[PDB]
């Protein structure tokens, strides 16, 4: 979904694959809903 809608560079793609906190938080500060939704779902799954 991200690569399609929010067209993604090679470095960003490689680092998202490697689960890199730097680019993850760059997106979360860029206010990317495709990622913020996933993270809010991780919260709603990490509740208990």
């Amino acid at each position: 979904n991200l690569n399609d809608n929010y067209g993604i560079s090679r470095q960003q793609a490689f680092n998202l694959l490697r689960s890199d906190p730097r680019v993850l938080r760059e997106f979360i500060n860029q206010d990317n809903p495709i990622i913020r939704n996933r993270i809010e779902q991780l919260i709603m799954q990490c509740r208990l």
Binding site: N3, D4, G7
Partner: protein, 397 residues
């Protein structure tokens, strides 16, 4: 762009008209046009692509003309003509896929995908055959500015909003008054709900108003206005504004009386309809004002009287609804519909070739955020990509 449409149209008409056995008296003009296109193209080198996962292609046209000597076309001629046409078709598809992706905040009408800038030259203007289609006609008109218009069936002009509004609320949410609405695509389903059924109200009547403000003016809209909105007519468990708590909503439908639909323009009223339902017309409107009421039945049977008492519990909430669907319409600007695949082609190309996000279109071209802010730059770029999409779809479907 006109030359792009002309290429596409004469290639379409060549794949259609030029078939074995046909009569040269029917395709002489199209053959002269095709040969002129070939001449104008011979000697140029085009480049296509360079954005996202779209490859970089090079085109070099050196073909041979089509013979004007025959009287009845044979297969040895059709085969060569089709070998010539498939290359042009791939070139045009690639140009359109190069042009649907790019954007600009400065002169979006001015072409991108520099092969198309090259085609905009004055040595390529000899290719024009006819510009009859709706999008290209409106393109040429809006350039030679005139009163234009696109025709739409079930247009998507309302951005998705499913929301409510409470004019009397409590923390317990046991005696409410308010209005709910779903504005989506071509439909507006609105429902004014009062939990007391207008017992404490004056004259046993409670009003509701819903104002929709379109971003672009429409014209000659055919609309279907029915009562008893459906998706606000069953039990529900809805969250508060602040998300703290929730509340129950058990509706019971009543008719809206003294109903009124005003189609307005720049605050002035244009059309007005009173107690009419079914099919209606709107000659021009930028704003819709629905106004309806909830009238407590002066007479009541035992059951409904035991449903509408004079105390606060109010376990059956009176409602009054209205569905309004725009079926057809006409607009000076370009939108999406439920008939045409232009937006779909554009979005599919961008999603396929992983186009980075640009300055003009929203990420992924989501029609909600694209029609909630329809600024002239977005409008121009959207018209351009929709036009080249129509072009590409005249050839590859």
């Amino acid at each position: 762009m006109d030359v792009l449409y002309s290429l596409s149209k004469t290639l379409k008409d060549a794949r259609d008209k030029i078939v074995e056995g046909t009569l040269y008296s029917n395709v002489s003009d199209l053959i002269q046009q095709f040969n002129q296109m070939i001449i104008t193209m011979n000697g140029n080198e085009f480049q296509t692509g360079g954005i996202g996962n779209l490859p970089i292609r090079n085109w070099n046209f050196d073909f041979g003309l089509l013979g004007t000597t025959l009287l009845n076309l044979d297969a040895n001629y059709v085969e060569t003509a089709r070998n010539t046409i498939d290359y042009f078709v791939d070139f045009v598809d690639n140009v359109c896929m190069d042009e649907m992706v790019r954007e600009s905040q400065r002169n979006g009408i001015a072409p991108q995908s520099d092969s198309l800038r090259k085609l905009s030259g004055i040595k390529f203007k000899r290719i024009n055959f006819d510009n009859s289609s709706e999008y290209i006609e409106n393109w040429n008109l809006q350039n030679r500015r005139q009163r234009t218009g696109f025709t739409f069936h079930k247009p998507n002009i309302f951005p998705y909003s499913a929301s409510f509004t409470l004019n009397r609320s409590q923390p317990a949410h046991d005696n409410l008054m308010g209005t709910m609405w779903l504005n989506a695509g071509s439909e507006i389903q609105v429902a004014g709900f009062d939990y007391s059924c207008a017992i404490n109200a004056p004259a046993n009547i409670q009003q509701f108003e819903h104002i929709v403000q379109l971003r672009r003016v429409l014209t000659t809209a055919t609309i279907t206005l029915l009562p008893d909105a459906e998706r606000f007519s069953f039990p529900r468990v809805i969250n508060s504004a602040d998300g703290a708590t929730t509340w129950y909503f058990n509706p019971v439908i009543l008719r809206p009386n003294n109903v009124e639909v005003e189609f307005l323009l720049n605050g002035q009223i244009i059309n007005t309809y009173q107690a009419r339902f079914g099919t209606i017309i709107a000659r021009n409107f930028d704003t819709i004002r629905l106004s309806f009421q909830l009238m407590r039945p002066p007479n009541m049977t035992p059951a409904v009287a035991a449903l509408f008492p004079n105390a606060q519990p109010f376990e059956h909430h009176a409602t009054v609804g209205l569905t309004l669907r725009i079926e057809s319409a006409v607009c000076e600007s370009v939108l999406a519909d439920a008939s045409k695949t232009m937006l779909a082609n554009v979005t599919s190309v961008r999603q396929e070739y992983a186009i980075p996000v640009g300055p003009v279109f929203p990420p992924g071209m989501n029609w909600t955020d694209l029609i909630t802010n329809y600024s002239p730059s977005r409008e121009d770029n959207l018209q351009r990509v929709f036009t080249v999409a129509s072009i590409r779809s005249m050839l590859v479907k």
